[PDB]
Design an enzyme around this catalytic site. Sequence first.
Site, PDB file in Angstrom:
ATOM      1  CG  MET A  77      -0.268   0.503   2.508  1.00 46.53           C
ATOM      2  SD  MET A  77      -1.487   0.612   3.821  1.00 46.53           S
ATOM      3  CE  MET A  77      -0.466   0.296   5.246  1.00 46.53           C
ATOM      4  CB  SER A  81       3.003  -4.628   2.455  1.00 42.44           C
ATOM      5  OG  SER A  81       2.523  -4.253   3.718  1.00 42.44           O
ATOM      6  CD  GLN A  82      -2.248  -3.079   0.277  1.00 44.48           C
ATOM      7  OE1 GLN A  82      -2.851  -2.916   1.332  1.00 44.48           O
ATOM      8  NE2 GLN A  82      -2.349  -2.237  -0.739  1.00 44.48           N
ATOM      9  CG  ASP A 135       5.428  -5.531  10.922  1.00 43.56           C
ATOM     10  OD1 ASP A 135       4.778  -4.460  10.936  1.00 43.56           O
ATOM     11  OD2 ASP A 135       5.680  -6.154   9.863  1.00 43.56           O
ATOM     12  CG  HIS A 192       6.013  -3.517   7.073  1.00 42.67           C
ATOM     13  ND1 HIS A 192       5.281  -4.688   7.140  1.00 42.67           N
ATOM     14  CD2 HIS A 192       6.088  -3.209   5.757  1.00 42.67           C
ATOM     15  CE1 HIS A 192       4.932  -5.063   5.927  1.00 42.67           C
ATOM     16  NE2 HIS A 192       5.407  -4.185   5.068  1.00 42.67           N
TER      17      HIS A 192
HETATM   18  S1  HDS Z   1       1.264  -3.002   3.749  1.00 40.10           S
HETATM   19  O1  HDS Z   1       1.881  -1.296   3.870  1.00 40.10           O
HETATM   20  O2  HDS Z   1       0.502  -2.924   2.236  1.00 40.10           O
HETATM   21  C1  HDS Z   1       0.347  -3.569   4.767  1.00 40.10           C
HETATM   22  C2  HDS Z   1      -0.939  -3.252   5.445  1.00 40.10           C
HETATM   23  C3  HDS Z   1      -0.605  -3.399   6.934  1.00 40.10           C
HETATM   24  C4  HDS Z   1      -1.827  -3.132   7.856  1.00 40.10           C
HETATM   25  C5  HDS Z   1      -2.056  -1.604   7.846  1.00 40.10           C
HETATM   26  C6  HDS Z   1      -3.437  -1.246   7.427  1.00 40.10           C
HETATM   27  C7  HDS Z   1      -4.281  -0.723   8.629  1.00 40.10           C
HETATM   28  C8  HDS Z   1      -5.674  -0.424   8.033  1.00 40.10           C
HETATM   29  C9  HDS Z   1      -6.553   0.343   9.087  1.00 40.10           C
HETATM   30  C10 HDS Z   1      -7.871   0.562   8.433  1.00 40.10           C
HETATM   31  C11 HDS Z   1      -8.913  -0.549   8.535  1.00 40.10           C
HETATM   32  C12 HDS Z   1     -10.054   0.017   7.780  1.00 40.10           C
HETATM   33  C13 HDS Z   1     -11.383   0.211   8.510  1.00 40.10           C
HETATM   34  C14 HDS Z   1     -12.300   1.047   7.658  1.00 40.10           C
HETATM   35  C15 HDS Z   1     -13.680   1.301   8.336  1.00 40.10           C
HETATM   36  C16 HDS Z   1     -14.235   2.501   7.759  1.00 40.10           C
END
Ligand code: HDS
EC number: 3.1.2.2
Length: 279
Positions: free
Chosen positions: A14, A88-89, A206, A262
Amino acid sequence: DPPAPLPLVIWHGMGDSCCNPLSMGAIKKMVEKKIPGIHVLSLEIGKTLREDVENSFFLNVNSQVTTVCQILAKDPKLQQGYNAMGFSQGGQFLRAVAQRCPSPPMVNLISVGGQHQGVFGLPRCPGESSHICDFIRKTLNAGAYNKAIQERLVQAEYWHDPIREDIYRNHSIFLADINQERGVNESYKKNLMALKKFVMVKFLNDTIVDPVDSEWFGFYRSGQAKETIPLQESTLYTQDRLGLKAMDKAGQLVFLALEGDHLQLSEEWFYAHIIPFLE
Ligand SMILES: *S(=O)(=O)CCCCCCCCCCCCCCCC
Ligand SMILES: *[C@H]1O[C@H](CO)[C@@H](O[C@@H]2O[C@H](CO)[C@@H](O)[C@H](O)[C@H]2NC(C)=O)[C@H](O)[C@H]1NC(C)=O
Ligand SMILES: *[C@@H]1O[C@H](CO)[C@@H](O)[C@H](O)[C@H]1NC(C)=O
Ligand SMILES: *[C@H]1O[C@H](CO)[C@@H](O)[C@H](O)[C@H]1NC(C)=O
């Protein structure tokens, strides 16, 4: 000769893009340094690097997977097999690719800090001794599982609430599907076992991924959000709904770990533990 080089496919995390000199582009060059001749394809979701970053947050994951599946199909250098590395994702998105579209055939899958059981907590907001951090995540359930939000927000699509798991099973349009939460999909199980090596890299320190165990396919034990259990102990493994227990049996699963926050890895470690699975 092509046998020697196995093409590598990369899917960024992301907030990142396919081709930034300081991040994906840097892995792309490092890999090209030691694997002479290798053809690397760094995925770009969208026409510009502007839509790419934006899409890593706002484009339905299921829609992204269909798009990348079409891209891998139109590339000839991949038709005989290809390794993939997700940051990551990008790790779970690439695993979806493996489970949904078996042609071209994916060989080795490298998960660098991926969230295979999703997440339940905010970055740098440990709920152990913090009432506010705990309050939020728990209260974001209705938000995260709302039909409209659940389709326009990427991170919501892998948000995994352990307390009210029934709601997560019934509303997650991505993670729940690739994780076999409603019903066991036969093609998913077979397609995942068709891989040769599934490597899960996990950063011991992490603070962005809660819980860190999700990086090794583990997660908070159902009913609460304090204690976590390993993959081998979950019913996904126990009933072997994805072929994860069979694969592990066959030595297809590798669990790597290293000190760091991370995505914190040296050019050295990368050379000593990742390049192998690619050469
Ligand atoms: S990586 O940088 O791609 C990994 C992602 C690691 C986890 C971080 C994301 C946290 C997301 C928080 C939001 C949840 C969404 C809830 C939305 C409700 C409106
Ligand atoms: C990084 O932070 C972790 C905490 O998450 C440190 O803890 C190691 O692993 C667990 C907890 O994660 C502890 O029970 C171990 O005792 C720790 N390992 C060791 C060295 O015994 C980890 O040590 C930290 N390392 C760094 C980079 O600071
Ligand atoms: C498994 O998932 C695919 C992709 O969503 C779907 O098309 C199919 O109906 C499901 N069943 C099987 C075993 O293919
Ligand atoms: C989601 O689906 C199940 C199965 O039909 C059913 O209990 C209900 O519609 C939802 N479950 C809950 C409690 O969220």
